[PDB]
Amino acid sequence: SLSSSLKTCYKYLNQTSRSFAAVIQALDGEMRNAVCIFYLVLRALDTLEDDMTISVEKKVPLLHNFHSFLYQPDWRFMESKEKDRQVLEDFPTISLEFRNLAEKYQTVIADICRRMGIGMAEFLDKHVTSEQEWDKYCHYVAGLVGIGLSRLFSASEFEDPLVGEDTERANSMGLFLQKTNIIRDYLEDQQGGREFWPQEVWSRYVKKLGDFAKPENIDLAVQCLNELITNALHHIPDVITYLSRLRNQSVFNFCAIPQVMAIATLAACYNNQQVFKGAVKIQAVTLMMDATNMPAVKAIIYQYMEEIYHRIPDSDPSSSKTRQIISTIRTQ
Numbered sequence: 001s002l003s004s005s006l007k008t009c010y011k012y013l014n015q016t017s018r019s020f021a022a023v024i025q026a027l028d029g030e031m032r033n034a035v036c037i038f039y040l041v042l043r044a045l046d047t048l049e050d051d052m053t054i055s056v057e058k059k060v061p062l063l064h065n066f067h068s069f070l071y072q073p074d075w076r077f078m079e080s081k082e083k084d085r086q087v088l089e090d091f092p093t094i095s096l097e098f099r100n101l102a103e104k105y106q107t108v109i110a111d112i113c114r115r116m117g118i119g120m121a122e123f124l125d126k127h128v129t130s131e132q133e134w135d136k137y138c139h140y141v142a143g144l145v146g147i148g149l150s151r152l153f154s155a156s157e158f159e160d161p162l163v164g165e166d167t168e169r170a171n172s173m174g175l176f177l178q179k180t181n182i183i184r185d186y187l188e189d190q191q192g193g194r195e196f197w198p199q200e201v202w203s204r205y206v207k208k209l210g211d212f213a214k215p216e217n218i219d220l221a222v223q224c225l226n227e228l229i230t231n232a233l234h235h236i237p238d239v240i241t242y243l244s245r246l247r248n249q250s251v252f253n254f255c256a257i258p259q260v261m262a263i264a265t266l267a268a269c270y271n272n273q274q275v276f277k278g279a280v281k282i283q284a285v286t287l288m289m290d291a292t293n294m295p296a297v298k299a300i301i302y303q304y305m306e307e308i309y310h311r312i313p314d315s316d317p318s319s320s321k322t323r324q325i326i327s328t329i330r331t332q
């Protein structure tokens with residue numbers, strides 16, 4: 001049945017994706033290969049972005065031109081020192097399967113890969129400063145993913161045109177996952193020399209972002225944490241809107257399950273000193289089972305919002321804001 005190279009792609013998906021492998025492979029019809037290949041192309045792109053052994057001067061053209069390599073049958077990259085580097089070394093297998101997809105899917109994937117490459121390259125010579133720049137960075141690495149997935153759903157015709165048209169809601173869906181991961185991964189990122197928390201926020205608490213790892217700064221660290229979580233909560237209305245429009249069951253699950261995992265993650269991290277001591281974990285199997293329709297997804301969201309709500313310290317500088325956003329979400 002499945003070709004040799006396509007079988008390899010699914011192996012690469014299963015090897016490199018904890019959050020998405022299962023939901024991708026459960027997608028109906030043409031969406032399955034289209035989303036699997038989209039995933040692997042972006043995974044390869046990210047593996048170059050993240051590799052600190054590649055100079056900025058070498059990295060910029062690679063990220064800028066990456067979308068064109070999809071059309072060059074023996075393009076590969078042998079100099080990665082990153083863990084996921086099979087997708088780069090065996091890129092010809094991935095690009096072959098890309099060129100086997102229908103044109104309408106090719107167009108979306110290449111457009112997103114082009115735009116993300118430009119965006120990633122832009123942020124090689126700066127850190128994230130303002131909250132606005134934080135949205136911008138998150139747009140480039142995650143918002144564009146949501147926009148691309150939405151365009152693939154509409155192109156497949158399992159979903160209505162509106163899904164791919166409403167780039168604001170698609171963008172928000174991606175932003176919610178990416179802000180959640182960035183918040184949760186403070187320490188692991190710190191330990192690999194990576195900084196993604198917005199400097200206009202953290203610099204109101206400490207002089208260097210790394211200072212949140214020091215035990216004496218825990219109180220300030222948690223305050224900043226709660227500010228950032230409060231920011232991320234503002235994406236939940238759009239997530240609800242986006243999910244409420246989906247018709248196909250496999251698409252709904254693919255979209256909803258990672259969103260509810262992110263909500264559960266934020267709730268676990270809220271006011272939690274452990275974020276600064278290791279990776280905070282969530283329920284996964286349960287949520288995978290329950291998050292298969294809108295009324296159940298809404299109920300899951302409201303349950304986690306009430307968990308956060310009744311944990312808000314009155315003294316937290318963001319407490320008013322956290323209460324307000326939770327109220328809005330509860331009222332949609």
Ligand SMILES: CC(C)=CCC/C(C)=C/CC/C(C)=C/[C@@H]1[C@@H](COP(=O)(O)OP(=O)(O)O)[C@]1(C)CC/C=C(\C)CCC=C(C)C
Nearest residue numbers: 017018019038039042043046142145146170173174177178
């Ligand atoms: C094409 C597909 C599913 C994903 C492509 C993922 C890739 C490789 C992107 C290259 C840049 C990166 C890395 C972005 C970060 C992804 C987490 O990876 P990871 O940390 O490895 O997870 P785990 O370790 O838990 O497995 C991220 C947070 C963005 C997720 C945003 C989505 C999915 C939009 C949802 C929106 C709608 C559905 C409207």
Ligand SMILES: [Mg+2]
Nearest residue numbers: 046047049050
């Ligand atoms: Mg990465």
Ligand SMILES: [Mg+2]
Nearest residue numbers: 046047049050
């Ligand atoms: Mg990266």
